[PDB]
Design a protein around this ligand. Structure first.
Ligand SMILES: *[C@@H]1O[C@H](CO[C@@H]2O[C@@H](C)[C@@H](O)[C@@H](O)[C@@H]2O)[C@@H](O[C@@H]2O[C@H](CO)[C@@H](O)[C@H](O)[C@H]2NC(C)=O)[C@H](O)[C@H]1NC(C)=O
Ligand SMILES: *[C@@H]1O[C@H](CO[C@@H]2O[C@@H](C)[C@@H](O)[C@@H](O)[C@@H]2O)[C@@H](O[C@@H]2O[C@H](CO)[C@@H](O)[C@H](O)[C@H]2NC(C)=O)[C@H](O)[C@H]1NC(C)=O
Ligand SMILES: N[C@H](Cc1c[nH]c2ccccc12)C(=O)NCCCCCCNc1c2c(nc3cc(Cl)ccc13)CCCC2
Ligand SMILES: *[C@@H]1O[C@H](CO[C@@H]2O[C@@H](C)[C@@H](O)[C@@H](O)[C@@H]2O)[C@@H](O)[C@H](O)[C@H]1NC(C)=O
Ligand SMILES: *[C@@H]1O[C@H](CO)[C@@H](O)[C@H](O)[C@H]1NC(C)=O
Ligand SMILES: *[C@@H]1O[C@H](CO)[C@@H](O)[C@H](O)[C@H]1NC(C)=O
Ligand SMILES: *[C@@H]1O[C@H](CO)[C@@H](O)[C@H](O)[C@H]1NC(C)=O
Ligand code: NA
Length: 526
C-alpha cells in the first residue's frame, strides 16, 4: 500500500471493482510547481521529499477557461474540470492491479481539449476498470494548457513554447524511472489520447526527446497534421504580443514583457486569451504546439513526409459524427434543443464562422463539394453537410492522411471507425456519434453495467478494451477468443479499416475517399 519512488514514498488507496481490487495513486507530483519565476518556463525536476506523500485524491487541474454555453447540462459539464483550478497542477495518477503485477504493460493517457482545456480527473478517464479487467497499469497526467502551457516567444527560454508538451514528456520520463517500483514494465508503454491528446501523441512520435519513453501509440480523433494542431510562428508571436497589449505588458525588451506577464494573476491571463485572435472559431486553438526547435525540430508536415519519426505500430481511428458537437457552439440555426434543420443560406453563413479567413471562392468550393445531393428535398441536407464538412476537414481526413503517410514507412497501422450512438446520451439524435464519445468505451465504463448502458454496449466495450490491451501488450489489436472479425493492417493501397458498433463489425475500404481528396489535395491551396 506504500510504494518507494526515486523522489520519495507515496501512499495510495484501495478500490473495489467487479469483486476485485485496484490500487489507485491519485495526485503524484511529477515536477516543481510552475509558479512565480517559473510560470511559462519548461518544467523543472522535482526535488526529493522525506515524508510519505498521500496520493489518495485527484490533484488540482491547470487553470483554463470553462465553457458556459450550457450551464447545468451534463452533456457538456461532464467535460469541464472536476477539481480546483490552479497554476500548481503538474501531477499524475497511477492505477495498478491488485495484487501488484510483475511486468505489466503500461498505458499512458493524454487528454484533449483543444490544448486550452481538459484534466486527467474526468470521470470518463477513470483508469480503474482497465487495471481490473486487463491487469495493465494506467497512468494519466495533467499538463499546462492555454497560454500558460503554450505561449511562445521562439528561442527565448522564458517563453519557448510547447511547455505543456514538455509537461507530458516529463511525466513519460517519470514512468521510465519509477513504474518498475509499481510492478510495471517501462519497456512496454503505450501512449494513448484523444483530440488534442491524440495530436499530442502524434507529436511525441516526431520528437526525438520522447523516442525512448514509449513503445507504441494510439490516436483517437486527432493528429498533428490537423489544421488546428500546430500554430505558426507568425501567428504565435502575433498572439503573444496581442496578449501583451491587452494586459498592458507591451515592452520592447522581449524578455521583460515576459517578466510583466509573470506578475499578472492567472485569471487576468485567462480573460484575454480569447481575443488575441481576430476571428475565432469553436475549434480555434489560440495557443498551441509550435516548431520550437527543441521539442519539435521542424515543421511536422515535413517530418511526416520524409519518414522522420519513431518506427513502431500505431492504432488510429475516428468517430462517424466528429463535427456535430461544434455546430451547436456557434453555427446559426443550430441548437441542441431542436432538430436544427437549416437552410442553404444558414449553411453558407455557417461556413464563414468555421472558415473565417478563407476566400469567397474557398467557401464556394466547399459548398460545391458537399451540396450535390442524392435527393434535393431532404430537409436535413444542409444540417448534415455542415456537420460532415467540419468533421472531415478537422478530424477524419487528417487522421486518414497521417495513417497513410506513417504506414508508408513499413510499420503496422490499424484504423477504426467508431459508429455507435449510445442510448444514454443527453444530446439529441441529429448529432450522431459525437466527438469524444468513444472514450468511455475505451475506458470500460459500460462494463459497470449499472444504469446507463445496454448489454450490447457492455459487450462492445469489453471487446474494444481487449483490442486496445492486445495492441498495448502485443502490437496487434485482435480479439482472438470470441470468433471476432479480424482487424486488418491498414496499408497505403487497399486502406482497409474496421468499424465498431453493437451490431455489425465489418471490414471496409477507403473511408471518406471522395470527400478527403478535396480536403487534402485541392483545399490546402486556396
Ligand atoms: C496580428 O495582430 C494585429 C493586432 O491585433 C489587434 O490587437 C489586439 C490587441 C487584439 O485586440 C485583436 O483583437 C486586434 O485584432 C492584427 O491587426 C488587426 O487586424 C484586425 C482585422 O483583421 C483589426 O482588429 C485591426 O484592424 C488590426 N489592428 C491593428 C492594431 O492593426 C493582425 O491582423 C494580426 N494578424 C496578422 C497575421 O498580422
Ligand atoms: C432551433 O433553435 C434556434 C434557437 O433556439 C431558441 O430560439 C430563440 C428564440 C431563443 O429562445 C434561443 O435562446 C433558443 O435557444 C433557432 O434559431 C433562431 O431562429 C429565429 C429565426 O428568426 C431567431 O430566433 C434567431 O435568429 C435564431 N437564433 C439563432 C440562430 O441563434 C432555430 O430557428 C431553431 N430551429 C428549429 C428547426 O427549431
Ligand atoms: N475552442 C476553444 C478551444 C478548443 C478548440 N478545439 C477544442 C476541442 C475541444 C475543447 C476545446 C477546444 C474552447 O475551449 N471551446 C469552444 C468549443 C467548445 C468545446 C467544449 C469542450 N468539451 C468537449 C470535449 C469533447 N467532446 C465534446 C463533445 C460535445 Cl457534444 C460537447 C463538448 C465536448 C472531447 C475532448 C474534450 C472536450
Ligand atoms: C497521510 O495519511 C495518513 C493516513 O491517512 C489514512 O488515510 C486517509 C484517507 C484517512 O482515512 C485517514 O484517517 C487514515 O489514517 C495520515 O495519518 C497522515 O497524517 C497523512 N499525512 C499528511 C501530510 O496529510
Ligand atoms: C520485463 O520484460 C522486459 C522485456 O519486455 C525484460 O527485459 C525485463 O527483465 C522484465 N522484468 C521483469 C520480469 O521484472
Ligand atoms: C534587456 O535586453 C537585453 C538584450 O537587448 C537582455 O540581454 C537583457 O537581459 C534585458 N534585460 C533584463 C533585465 O533581462
Ligand atoms: C467472450 O465471451 C464470453 C462469453 O462466452 C464473455 O464472458 C467474455 O467477456 C468475452 N470476452 C471478450 C474479451 O470479449
Ligand atoms: Na476513482
Amino acid at each position: 500500500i506504500i510504494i518507494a519512488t526515486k523522489n520519495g514514498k507515496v501512499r495510495g488507496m484501495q478500490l473495489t471493482v467487479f469483486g476485485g481490487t485496484v490500487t489507485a495513486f491519485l495526485g503524484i507530483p511529477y515536477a516543481q510547481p510552475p509558479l512565480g519565476r517559473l510560470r511559462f518556463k519548461k518544467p523543472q525536476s522535482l526535488t526529493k521529499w522525506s515524508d510519505i506523500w498521500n496520493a489518495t485524491k485527484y490533484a488540482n487541474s491547470c487553470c483554463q477557461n470553462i465553457d458556459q454555453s450550457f450551464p447545468g447540462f451534463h452533456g457538456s459539464e461532464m467535460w469541464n474540470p472536476n477539481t480546483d483550478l490552479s497554476e500548481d497542477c503538474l501531477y499524475l495518477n497511477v492505477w495498478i492491479p491488485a495484487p501488484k503485477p510483475k511486468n505489466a504493460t503500461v498505458l499512458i493517457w493524454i487528454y484533449g481539449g483543444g490544448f486550452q482545456t481538459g484534466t486527467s480527473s474526468l470521470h470518463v478517464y477513470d483508469g480503474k476498470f482497465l487495471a481490473r479487467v486487463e491487469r495493465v497499469i494506467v497512468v494519466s497526467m495533467n499538463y499546462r494548457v492555454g497560454a500558460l502551457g503554450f505561449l511562445a516567444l521562439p528561442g527565448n527560454p522564458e517563453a519557448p513554447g510547447n511547455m505543456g508538451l514538455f509537461d507530458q514528456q516529463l511525466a513519460l520520463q517519470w514512468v521510465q524511472k519509477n513504474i518498475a517500483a509499481f510492478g510495471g514494465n517501462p519497456k512496454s508503454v503505450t501512449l494513448f489520447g484523444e483530440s488534442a491528446g491524440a495530436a499530442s501523441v502524434s507529436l511525441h512520435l516526431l520528437s526525438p526527446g520522447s523516442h525512448s519513453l514509449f513503445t507504441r501509440a494510439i490516436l483517437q480523433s486527432g493528429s498533428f497534421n490537423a489544421p488546428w494542431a500546430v500554430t505558426s510562428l507568425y501567428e504565435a508571436r502575433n498572439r503573444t504580443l496581442n496578449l501583451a497589449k491587452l494586459t498592458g505588458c507591451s515592452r520592447e525588451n522581449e524578455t521583460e514583457i515576459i517578466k510583466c506577464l509573470r506578475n499578472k494573476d492567472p485569471q487576468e491571463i485567462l480573460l484575454n486569451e480569447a481575443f488575441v485572435v481576430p476571428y475565432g472559431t469553436p475549434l480555434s486553438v489560440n495557443f498551441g504546439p509550435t516548431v520550437d526547435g527543441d521539442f519539435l525540430t521542424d515543421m511536422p508536415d515535413i517530418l511526416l513526409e520524409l519518414g522522420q519519426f519513431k518506427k513502431t505500430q500505431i492504432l488510429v481511428g475516428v468517430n462517424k459524427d466528429e463535427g456535430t458537437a461544434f455546430l451547436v457552439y456557434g453555427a446559426p440555426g443550430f441548437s441542441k434543443d431542436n432538430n436544427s434543420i437549416i437552410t442553404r443560406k444558414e449553411f453558407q453563413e455557417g461556413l464563414k464562422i468555421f472558415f473565417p479567413g478563407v476566400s469567397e471562392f474557398g467557401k464556394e468550393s466547399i459548398l460545391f463539394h458537399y451540396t450535390d445531393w442524392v435527393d434535393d428535398q431532404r430537409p436535413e441536407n444542409y444540417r448534415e453537410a455542415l456537420g460532415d464538412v467540419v468533421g472531415d476537414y478537422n478530424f477524419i481526413c487528417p487522421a486518414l492522411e497521417f495513417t497513410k503517410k506513417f504506414s508508408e514507412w513499413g510499420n503496422n497501422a490499424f484504423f477504426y471507425y467508431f459508429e455507435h450512438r449510445s442510448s444514454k446520451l443527453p444530446w439529441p439524435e441529429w448529432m450522431g456519434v459525437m466527438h469524444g464519445y468513444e472514450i468511455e468505451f475505451v475506458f470500460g465504463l459500460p462494463l459497470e453495467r449499472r444504469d446507463q448502458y445496454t448489454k450490447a454496449e457492455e459487450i462492445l466495450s469489453r471487446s474494444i478494451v481487449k483490442r486496445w490491451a492486445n495492441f498495448a501488450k502485443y502490437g496487434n489489436p485482435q480479439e482472438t477468443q470470441n470468433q471476432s472479425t479480424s482487424w486488418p493492417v491498414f496499408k497505403s493501397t487497399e486502406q482497409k479499416y474496421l468499424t465498431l458498433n453493437t451490431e455489425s463489425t465489418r471490414i471496409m475500404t477507403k473511408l471518406r475517399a471522395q470527400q478527403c481528396r478535396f480536403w487534402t489535395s485541392f483545399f490546402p491551396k486556396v
